[PDB]
Amino acid sequence: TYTDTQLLIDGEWVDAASGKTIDVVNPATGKPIGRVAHAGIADLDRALAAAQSGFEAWRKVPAHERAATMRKAAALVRERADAIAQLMTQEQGKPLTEARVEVLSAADIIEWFADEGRRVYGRIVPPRNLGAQQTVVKEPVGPVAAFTPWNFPVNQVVRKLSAALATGCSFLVKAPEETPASPAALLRAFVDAGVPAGVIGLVYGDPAEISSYLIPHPVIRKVTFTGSTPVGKQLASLAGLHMKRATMELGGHAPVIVAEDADVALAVKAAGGAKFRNAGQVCISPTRFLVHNSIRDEFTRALVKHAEGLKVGNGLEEGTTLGALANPRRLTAMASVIDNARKVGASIETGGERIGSEGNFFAPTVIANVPLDADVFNNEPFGPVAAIRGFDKLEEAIAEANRLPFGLAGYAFTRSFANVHLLTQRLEVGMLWINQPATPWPEMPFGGVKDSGYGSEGGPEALEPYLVTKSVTVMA
Amino acid sequence: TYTDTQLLIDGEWVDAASGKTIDVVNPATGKPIGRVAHAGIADLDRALAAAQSGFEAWRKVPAHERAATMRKAAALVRERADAIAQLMTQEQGKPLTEARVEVLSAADIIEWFADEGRRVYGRIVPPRNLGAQQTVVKEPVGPVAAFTPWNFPVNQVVRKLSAALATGCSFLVKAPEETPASPAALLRAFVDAGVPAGVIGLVYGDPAEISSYLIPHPVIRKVTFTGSTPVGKQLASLAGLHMKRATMELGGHAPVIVAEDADVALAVKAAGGAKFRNAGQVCISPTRFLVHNSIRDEFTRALVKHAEGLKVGNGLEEGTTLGALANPRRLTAMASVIDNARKVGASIETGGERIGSEGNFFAPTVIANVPLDADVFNNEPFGPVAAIRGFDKLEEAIAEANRLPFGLAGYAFTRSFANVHLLTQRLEVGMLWINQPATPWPEMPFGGVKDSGYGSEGGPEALEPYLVTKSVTVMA
Amino acid sequence: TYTDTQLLIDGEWVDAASGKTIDVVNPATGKPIGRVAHAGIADLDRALAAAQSGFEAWRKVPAHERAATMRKAAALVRERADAIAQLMTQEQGKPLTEARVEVLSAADIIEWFADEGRRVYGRIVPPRNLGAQQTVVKEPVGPVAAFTPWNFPVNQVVRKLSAALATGCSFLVKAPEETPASPAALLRAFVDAGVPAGVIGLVYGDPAEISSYLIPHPVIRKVTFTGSTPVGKQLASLAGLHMKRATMELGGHAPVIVAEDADVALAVKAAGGAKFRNAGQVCISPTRFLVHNSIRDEFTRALVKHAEGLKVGNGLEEGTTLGALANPRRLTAMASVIDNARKVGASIETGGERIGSEGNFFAPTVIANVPLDADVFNNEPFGPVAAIRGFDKLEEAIAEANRLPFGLAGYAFTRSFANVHLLTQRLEVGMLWINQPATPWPEMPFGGVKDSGYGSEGGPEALEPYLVTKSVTVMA
Amino acid sequence: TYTDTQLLIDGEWVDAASGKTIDVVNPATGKPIGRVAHAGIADLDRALAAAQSGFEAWRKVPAHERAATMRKAAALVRERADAIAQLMTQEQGKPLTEARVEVLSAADIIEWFADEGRRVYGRIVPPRNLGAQQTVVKEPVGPVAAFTPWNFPVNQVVRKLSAALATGCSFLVKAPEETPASPAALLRAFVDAGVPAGVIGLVYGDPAEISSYLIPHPVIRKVTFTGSTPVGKQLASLAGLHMKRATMELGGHAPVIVAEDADVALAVKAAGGAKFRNAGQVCISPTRFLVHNSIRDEFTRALVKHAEGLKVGNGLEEGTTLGALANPRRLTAMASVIDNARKVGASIETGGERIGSEGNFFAPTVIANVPLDADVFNNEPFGPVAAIRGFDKLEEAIAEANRLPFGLAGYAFTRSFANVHLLTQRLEVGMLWINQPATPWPEMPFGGVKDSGYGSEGGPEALEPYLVTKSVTVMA
């Protein structure tokens, strides 16, 4: 089974006013599995009024009470994690084992942010005149509009929602029409835990119509988007025209630097595992493997061996470790990336093809001998493709790593302090993981640089985009 | 004496390749006093290249060395304060005494920021696996494009410049064509102190063309603009379209709430004195005077008396306490504000006319019986005009204070703790001063909310728009 | 019912080696209710070995796991709060309603410290040479010896224990022989929640023999004591002789300043309620009431009215609001304080006598017209006695407030910002509460100044006495 | 030239009421050079009264004014660096070049602390009831009694003095009778800068009698001592008996771990150079050289060569790189250390004798084949003596590094990240420097663990022993 999804407005699950719905298909099959309410402008006016009213309510609830309510939502997300994961796998394609991991960590994230909300500290500044008190108070910015994409239906809502809620903001999210049930199950946990009516809202419909209406509207004080770099540029431009606070989490093109002193088995296990996680459909997925010439061939073979050991299948089989891609455009885009690679003289080491003629299954693919003008080494592939090149000198790996307008994550494998320290200072990324896969715990900052966007969704830094800082000076 | 001003590119004071200049007028007389170079695209290209190199240089200079270099520049600014102030008054209109105060407070800013650059701290997070070290590191964002207005020619530059230098970014500023010499003099103190070629640049010319070229350019990593709300919106739109970090300090419309228990005489002294400072051409200037009805008449008359005491004349003549407005557009703008007040039934209690027929002199003006639809109570007048309205309940004054889309500064006068705490919580402003005029020290955050923009220019918060946060996790 | 109490050593509840026990009496009755193991030196050697081994174990458990374990202990303390409170009332005398409040808030404290342990942050310092990394790491100091008194058997263990546990330290507490069962029930929750063997230890016996042995012993790296000022001086002296880190929470003598603009009903309700809480047996209990002459008489009558409305009785009756004093020396000391008051010419307004001839019931007592040489206005009474004097000028109240070598808490009632600000800057206390009773939440610092001791048991500051800070600089 | 030194009391350089003096010797010659006033109880009484008044004064001076005053003092210290260094070398023994370095680094300290005084921040805690404001405020503790040793006469004073002045405490120091003039000269820079009468005081005399009088005295709120472990224990015992805040910087015994992958030449240059700095009379001097057996012989010979290169002679003669030891007790102490090394079977590889028959000259000495029971490997030698021992496993070196009750500084040389991280975690020291000598900058914490005491003299942490934390909760 798989349920139809409704809008959440003012504490109620409701149909759109007009009754219109959008069909939802299972990517592993191509067959309808349900429908989602298609909101129009009238449903949006009701969500906005409600968000305003919810903000006036929520900002008055003391932080410790807000925290206890959020921890209650978290316990419910944990309990319902298998049922929610089954919804997710069906609508998005990832393996059930991966969906379960995603939802359980959603509960972890909520819990950390609930406690963070109690530690939004102000400051007292030693004054220039002892007869005055000089303070810096932090307070919530107001109603937030969030736009979240399909690759992690739950986890891309959960950080934004948790940070908003921990600060005293209300929250109105447009989630993906193609993966709508698992984000709605997340918000249902919050409604059941006692977050009052209007603090949270959820809508689905025509993405352009919704974002063009919410972002200029005077109820909304803060906008947050995660998605593609070109769509973000369009939304950050609209937000700027209406002077709205904005954060953006966009495309990455993560380099992997395998230094001469690297453990190779480890690199392959850690970066290769990470590459094929959610079929490469991750803003932090390692893409450009820069491997020292001394071990390049050995690395390339071991990666090929890892790709070929993946069990492609419908994500509901527990043994499936590579599911279908999320939707048919991902096939088109993977076909295009692989064509261009062949055309520019790269070698397709394994994979490189659609599997079957039903659903969106594409084969895990490793490209070697990749020239620098290849599409895969310039545009974000966002799919189950690795591209390998060699280097001699660590300084040339770093410059390659920094060549692109992205961005976001980077990985490396090395053992010397000197290399760790050099990669730390020089690599143009928001997050760098060395000798392990990505472990984006909620207490670590998470966000990009350059075209990958700005603002963090972890650590205390994650609260700041939702806060206003106010200087107060009172002469006694 | 008044000097002609050049562009600063890659260590060198130079003319524009085209040789073009713009005439500089003294607002007190209407008479030409000098000229400034009118930069074109070609000179911007050399500034941008120089900025790139300067960033590579300055990012490598240890913070304690950057700090000592910045502190020398500040010592130079102090040494040259009379000369700088003389240039400012001539080009901008303010009295010599206020110019000197601006220039000295510039030095105070540079010093605080010099020291703050040494305290851009990272952090170490207790890890989930004890074999890994989880750190968060702070780094400079990159080359900055800055755009600054004419109201405080030196001070609007210095906070942006100081922030950028303390973090290790390079800095390219477009300063006002109408007030070129005093900022160029500030920049010349930094060159003479030892800031290397390319780290700082200064251009003048057509503002639209400079903005449109610098903001989309891939060398610029971060944009900062101080100015009016409409231009900031156009600039933030563009920044967004090209995914640039942006901060904005825009229009204010500061309410002043004089409560039933206020010390009226202190209220007149503090907020009257602040009103006519720089002839009200200040983003935090008290404008909407909300006075409890019990003391409204007493307050109006005392404010009228304070306006009448002011000595209007040329800024070089000692005695002068209110100079000329900075340009002919401000006179037209004041007559419109006053014509509208009268049209809508308000009473001009004093002032309200041009003085003489040469230069930009406007009498200090107090308006009462102001209806809620008068231009002065909706648009930022940015001029030597106070508007007074009465209230009965503090709650009504608070709701009026929040009514407009602006939210920069707020003022109040009251003695009860409960009202301090209420005002602190409820007022939608970035900065609030109670029982005193504004004292915007560099250690205090300084920035807006709503249509007044975002990002702070004081406190440790002023460094954050100039920094990227990198999560680094290394497994042993 | 009421249970006999054992030692906790190495995960096991055990008798002392020798079999010796100490009888426990109910203060409301004077009758034996049980016994507690009397530890000797051999039991201490076993506790110390175990604490060493527990420290090596606990310091290796990642913080998030430590937190989850502590939150589990907390949920068990919450569930068992009524059963634990019944033990407490019996052995200590406080009303059951007060005992329940104490234990429930113990669970709150644990939960806040569990999350605090995850936020023990290090720092990265911008280096003087870019080739080095300069860091500040925080790590646990080691095995802690804690000595806790009888007035709040559970809450004086719980803060020390929680802070130790959140930092990675092991913990060995000597709890009170006269109130031993409710602290043992607290530690039992931690054992049941999965804190491993030896991380926590609990012993009872001859207070001088235990503290003389634990404090010099090389396993113990940190000592913490809460109790009387003269006993602390002796223990801080021993700790200093063996160079052991020490914190001390000692006697208070809390002033209450009721200013001329005070709400009187509120002052009486808030400070009077607080005075008779746990029969005045609290280091923060308001003792010296300094009331403005204009309302002194009205305050004195309303306090008398509050004291006379207390229902004296055995604490197990739900309606009892003043229980018996904790032990027979409290009667002797209250007899002495009241004698001296009468002798120096003070007036006993109500109470002043033992009630009955069984148990330790003393009457709630209010003394007025108190000269400055009266014992009650110099030595900490630690019992159900208030002492009232007048003042004319707020500055004279403050000097009186600051006259004594204590210390700890202070209270006031006033409405003006000016007074709030003056009391804030001038009053020599660790904690100041204004227009309310004490609400010592775990997120607020808690500790004294002067003879009241040093170190805080709340806020992040509470972790620092358990941490070592290490500067690390590594040249690449 | 060398000058006689006086007491500094309440703004005035004065003699002791008794008129007594102590002779000051030049350690390089044995010859008298001057005298210092020998303070008695009566002069201490005037210092204590003056300290009380000075505290009342300085606590009222806004932090930005305190900072500017401190920065002037620092500018004076720089101006007078040759003169101060001349006094130091004469009285203390170190070469002129090292004295000048000490004096200049003093100025650097004062400046950092000046700036840190402006950033003693309080905080605002999200409240449990929104009608209350919960703040935590920082205040100066009160008058300080400081006791400082002869090894860095100016530098051991300056950190304590700077900390105390930045927080707003007053300061009374007993400096070394054997090296009086250079600290008095430092204190004279603060008097000439404008620090008011009473805020700073300076006495000399009988150390025991001064200590016993100042520590129990009710004017003294905080004690700080730098010195040997046995005297610190006696002083901490007394501080404790009178419930005074105390910090202690005591004996160190720094291990140096040269790992199998070390750069041996850098190891010799960094830790050899640091060994003979101030002829090893430093609390963080490398002493126990633990060298991997593979490179031990290479290391020993290179260190012997570096010791042999040093130029022994009077500190005023240029060329001199190792001066005389500071007093005759240090010669006796070195002969004992060397007599014991030889008795226990170690080999003296170079040095190990007195040079000449006048003054306190000792040859730079390297000892190898050192058994674990030799005095040099258990007691702090505080002299120009390195002891070398080999190891096979890094784990054995780490367990030796931790074996002693001292734990001040530690050094290592290694290239692998895993060893940096291991050493960082496992070494029981306050400060660790890897691949470089010690660089104790004022922004880095500086303090011990175990028998080396407690409290930091660097970083923001250096201010915390000089501050009290006050929780303030005000209900509207």
Residue numbers in the entry:
A (entry chain A), B (entry chain B), C (entry chain A), D (entry chain B): 5 to 480
Relevant lines from the article:
To elucidate the molecular mechanism of 3-HP producing ALDHs, we determined the crystal structure of AbKGSADH at a 2.25 Å resolution. The overall structure of AbKGSADH shows a conventional conformation for the ALDH fold. The monomeric structure of AbKGSADH consists of three domains: two core domains and one oligomerization domain (OGD). The core domains consist of the N-terminal domain (NTD) (Met1-Arg123 and Val145-Leu253) and the C-terminal domain (CTD) (Gly254-Pro469). The NTD is composed of seven α-helices (α1–α7) and nine β-strands (β1–β4 and β7–β11), and forms the NAD(P)-binding Rossmann fold, where seven β-strands (β1–β2 and β7–β11) form a large β-sheet packed in the middle of the domain and other two β-strands (β3–β4) are located on the surface of the domain. The CTD consists of seven α-helices (α8–α14) and seven β-strands (β12–β18). The OGD (Val124-Pro144 and Tyr470-Val481) has two long β-strands (β6 and β19) and one short β-strand (β5), which are packed in a line and protrude from the NTD. Although there are two AbKGSADH molecules in the asymmetric unit of our present structures, the tetrameric structure can be easily generated by one of the two folds from the P4322 crystallographic symmetry operation. Dimerization is mainly mediated by the OGD and the CTD of AbKGSADH. Three β-strands in the OGD and a β-sheet in the middle of the CTD form big β-sheet, and tetramerization of AbKGSADH is mediated by the OGD and two α-helices (α2, α3).
